Amino acid sequence: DNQKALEEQMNSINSVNDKLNKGKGKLSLSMNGNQLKATSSNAGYGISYEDKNWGIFVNGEKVYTFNEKSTVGNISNDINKLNIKGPYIEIKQI
């Protein structure tokens, strides 16, 4: 697996946006030490009208499941509660 999560600090946490960032609505995530930062662009919209199952895996532990069915806006409202902190976070679709 990712021993040091070096690759995670390269593309990973940037590309995680690239799945979420599609059109109608999109999601963006960042960190600040032990801080979690999510943003939905277009403020409330979802992908379009499709279904997607997602997760966030701390060392291979899916701590949260969101669906692009849910507007990535309303989802980032959730990302504020869930407050996804380290370590090793794998945010991707499943």
GROMACS .gro file of C-alpha atoms in nm:
model
   94
    1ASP     CA    1   0.000   0.000   0.000
    2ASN     CA    2   0.098   0.366   0.037
    3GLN     CA    3   0.370   0.339   0.302
    4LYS     CA    4   0.437   0.712   0.324
    5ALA     CA    5   0.144   0.836   0.115
    6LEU     CA    6   0.394   1.032  -0.094
    7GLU     CA    7   0.185   0.995  -0.410
    8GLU     CA    8  -0.113   1.120  -0.211
    9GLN     CA    9   0.056   1.455  -0.168
   10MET     CA   10   0.121   1.474  -0.542
   11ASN     CA   11  -0.184   1.409  -0.758
   12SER     CA   12  -0.417   1.228  -0.526
   13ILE     CA   13  -0.563   1.513  -0.321
   14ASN     CA   14  -0.572   1.727  -0.630
   15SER     CA   15  -0.723   1.468  -0.862
   16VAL     CA   16  -0.991   1.394  -0.599
   17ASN     CA   17  -1.134   1.723  -0.715
   18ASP     CA   18  -1.119   1.616  -1.078
   19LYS     CA   19  -1.389   1.350  -1.016
   20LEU     CA   20  -1.610   1.577  -0.825
   21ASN     CA   21  -1.546   1.870  -1.056
   22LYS     CA   22  -1.763   1.777  -1.355
   23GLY     CA   23  -2.011   2.049  -1.450
   24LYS     CA   24  -2.352   2.121  -1.295
   25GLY     CA   25  -2.206   2.074  -0.953
   26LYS     CA   26  -1.870   1.980  -0.822
   27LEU     CA   27  -1.670   1.922  -0.508
   28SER     CA   28  -1.326   2.034  -0.400
   29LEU     CA   29  -1.122   1.941  -0.096
   30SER     CA   30  -0.807   2.063   0.075
   31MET     CA   31  -0.632   2.048   0.411
   32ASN     CA   32  -0.448   2.271   0.654
   33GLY     CA   33  -0.237   2.070   0.896
   34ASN     CA   34  -0.520   1.874   1.055
   35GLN     CA   35  -0.790   2.084   0.892
   36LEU     CA   36  -1.039   1.975   0.629
   37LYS     CA   37  -1.164   2.207   0.359
   38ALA     CA   38  -1.445   2.124   0.114
   39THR     CA   39  -1.601   2.337  -0.156
   40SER     CA   40  -1.881   2.277  -0.404
   41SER     CA   41  -1.874   2.494  -0.708
   42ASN     CA   42  -2.194   2.638  -0.853
   43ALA     CA   43  -2.305   2.643  -0.490
   44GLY     CA   44  -2.548   2.355  -0.449
   45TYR     CA   45  -2.570   2.167  -0.776
   46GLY     CA   46  -2.492   1.799  -0.834
   47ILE     CA   47  -2.318   1.626  -1.125
   48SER     CA   48  -2.634   1.640  -1.323
   49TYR     CA   49  -2.889   1.364  -1.288
   50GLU     CA   50  -2.693   1.049  -1.225
   51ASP     CA   51  -2.597   0.821  -0.938
   52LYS     CA   52  -2.255   0.778  -0.781
   53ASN     CA   53  -2.133   0.606  -0.468
   54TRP     CA   54  -1.838   0.760  -0.289
   55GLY     CA   55  -1.611   0.706   0.005
   56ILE     CA   56  -1.323   0.846   0.210
   57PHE     CA   57  -1.072   0.594   0.337
   58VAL     CA   58  -0.838   0.666   0.629
   59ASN     CA   59  -0.578   0.387   0.593
   60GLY     CA   60  -0.835   0.182   0.406
   61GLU     CA   61  -1.130   0.276   0.622
   62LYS     CA   62  -1.435   0.422   0.451
   63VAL     CA   63  -1.535   0.681   0.709
   64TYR     CA   64  -1.797   0.859   0.497
   65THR     CA   65  -2.022   0.771   0.204
   66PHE     CA   66  -2.168   1.046  -0.016
   67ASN     CA   67  -2.352   1.012  -0.342
   68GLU     CA   68  -2.330   1.254  -0.634
   69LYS     CA   69  -2.707   1.205  -0.635
   70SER     CA   70  -2.681   1.426  -0.335
   71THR     CA   71  -2.573   1.766  -0.457
   72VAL     CA   72  -2.200   1.805  -0.396
   73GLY     CA   73  -2.311   2.127  -0.235
   74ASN     CA   74  -2.533   1.959   0.022
   75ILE     CA   75  -2.256   1.702   0.044
   76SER     CA   76  -1.994   1.964   0.128
   77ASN     CA   77  -2.238   2.086   0.386
   78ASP     CA   78  -2.181   1.735   0.519
   79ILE     CA   79  -1.808   1.759   0.471
   80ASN     CA   80  -1.823   2.045   0.722
   81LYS     CA   81  -1.978   1.817   0.985
   82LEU     CA   82  -1.782   1.499   0.907
   83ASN     CA   83  -1.464   1.712   0.918
   84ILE     CA   84  -1.244   1.465   0.731
   85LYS     CA   85  -0.905   1.479   0.903
   86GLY     CA   86  -0.590   1.271   0.854
   87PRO     CA   87  -0.422   1.045   0.837
   88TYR     CA   88  -0.400   0.882   0.486
   89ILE     CA   89  -0.725   0.987   0.324
   90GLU     CA   90  -0.852   0.812   0.015
   91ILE     CA   91  -1.144   1.013  -0.115
   92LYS     CA   92  -1.266   0.851  -0.441
   93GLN     CA   93  -1.562   0.673  -0.596
   94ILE     CA   94  -1.617   0.307  -0.541
   0.00000   0.00000   0.00000
